[PDB]
Structure formats: structure tokens, C-alpha cells
């Protein structure tokens, strides 16, 4: 069982997806000991699948955090194509 603490941010769902890929049940929580103002969340993962041939590209941060594809218009601060 893998128990970790994650700071909630825009890159929080990708970690959950990877954990679901490697674990049979993944679930997050916030124990009362952790202060409510803090953004930390404790996620546990039970039922390790233990693959015979794990994908090294699955645990590589270079592509785990791949960015999602996309009148006084909204300020263009998302870069260019």
C-alpha cells in the first residue's frame, strides 16, 4: 500500500490516474489532524498490480505531466500554438 501526501494543484489528477494504473483501489482523504487551511491531501493506494513489464515511460515525469490539448476578449496569457 502506497500512502502519500499531495499538494492539490492543476497536476493532481494525473498522479491519481497513475496511481489507479498501478493500484487496484486509489482513494484520497484529509485526516482531521491536518489543518483545514492547508492544501495537503493524503491519498492511499491499495492492491498493487505488480506488472511483470512496467512501462518506464509511465513513471517518467517528462510525459506524466503532459499539458492537455486546447467584446474585450479574455487576456491572452496561455502562450501560442
Amino acid at each position: 500500500t502506497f500512502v502519500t501526501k499531495i499538494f492539490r494543484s492543476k497536476d493532481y489528477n494525473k498522479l491519481i490516474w497513475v496511481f489507479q494504473q498501478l493500484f487496484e483501489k486509489v482513494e484520497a482523504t484529509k485526516p482531521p489532524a491536518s489543518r483545514n487551511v492547508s492544501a495537503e491531501i493524503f491519498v492511499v493506494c491499495k492492491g498493487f498490480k505488480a506488472p511483470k513489464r512496467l512501462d518506464p515511460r509511465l513513471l517518467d515525469p517528462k510525459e506524466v505531466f503532459e499539458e492537455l490539448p486546447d467584446e474585450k476578449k479574455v487576456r491572452k496569457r496561455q502562450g501560442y500554438e
Binding site: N13, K14, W17, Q20, Q21, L22, P31, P32, N36, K49, P51, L54, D55, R57, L58, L68
Partner: protein, 123 residues
Amino acid sequence: VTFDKDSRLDYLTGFHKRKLQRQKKAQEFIKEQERLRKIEERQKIRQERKEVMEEQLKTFKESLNAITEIYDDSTTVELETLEPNDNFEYLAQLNNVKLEKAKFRYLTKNERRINQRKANDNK
């Protein structure tokens, strides 16, 4: 296991269709349960009315007290009786059928309540 882009896009891009699908399923389940409880309510009402009607009848009862014929010319005549009043058969069949039938929470509840109040009064 393998790392596939389609699964990660399906998981990340969603989070909203899944919630509305769950809401639709819950709503239709609630509607089905309501229709059920309604029909069993109908059952209870009909049974009450039938029982009171039978009791009324019972308590009023106490207060009460093809032939074919051949001729010599080889010609045959067919004679069948007819029933113009069909009520006799209906009452007889009613009498015949009547004869035939007869979750986990972290802390203590007190501590949980204090924590909830301390979180609530701040806002």
C-alpha cells in the same frame, strides 16, 4: 501494465460527464421507487375497500333473515335451444368461481460536532 494516452485523456477530460450520468441514474432510480411505492399504496387502498365491502355484505346478510330428427323423406331437422338472456350464464359463472375459491467517520461524535461548529462559525 501500460501507459496509454487515450485512457488518460478519457479520465482527465471528463470528471463532468460521469457526475451527470450518476445524477441521471440516481434520479431515474428515485422515480422508479416513487412509482413502486405508489402502486403498493394503491394495493393497500383497494384491499381496504374490498374488505369493507365484503364486511358490509356479510352484516347485511344477517339483517336479511342440438338435436337432429330424421323423417321418412331422408330430410333432417336440427333443433337447438337459444339463450336470449346472457345474464343467467354470467351469474352462474360468478357463483361457480365463488364456489371454486371458497459511512466511516474519523473522530468521536462529540469531537466531530465541536470541530464542525468551530469550522462553521468562522464563515
